[PDB]
Amino acid sequence: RHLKRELKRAQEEVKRIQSVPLVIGQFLEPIDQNTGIVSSTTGMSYVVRILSTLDRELLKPSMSVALHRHS
Amino acid sequence: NVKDLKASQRVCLRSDSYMLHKVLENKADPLVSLMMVEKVPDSTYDMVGG
Incomplete structure (x- = not known):
């Protein structure tokens, strides 16, 4: 149940990299x-x-695609 | 090794000091390029017969 908190905190991180x-x-x-x-x-x-x-x-x-800046 | 790398092989480079990492899977023959933009069908003897 503790690791379901940790899967969510790791899922958040990466969605911020997806976006603008x-x-x-x-x-x-x-x-x-x-x-x-x-x-x-x-x-x-x-x-x-x-x-x-x-x-x-x-x-x-x-087909077009999005890329990250520095990374 | 430089034994594996052959002429006109597309490679991977890491733009930090241009150090060769891997051979790149991709590569096209330059003649496959010229033959295709032309484009010319081939045939068999029975479709040109009579």
Whole structure:
């Protein structure tokens, strides 16, 4: 019952990273599915980890996407 | 090793000092590129027959 408090405090942390401020890149293709290639909108390629617990149903065909700033 | 890395292999780099981490899975032949933007079907002998 104590660890159900700790799953909630860990779930909060990560939703704040999901949300604004974000730069918009594009997803080219996976190289796994926990790691992919995105081109930011600075005209460079980056290899980025993918937040597990996301829908790859529309993701795998190339399509806009959100990325974190410094991270 | 530099035995594994072959020419025109797309690699991973970590922009901290540009140190090679892994070989990258991806890579396309440059001829697969030129043949596809052209696009030309192939066939068999029976569909060109008569």
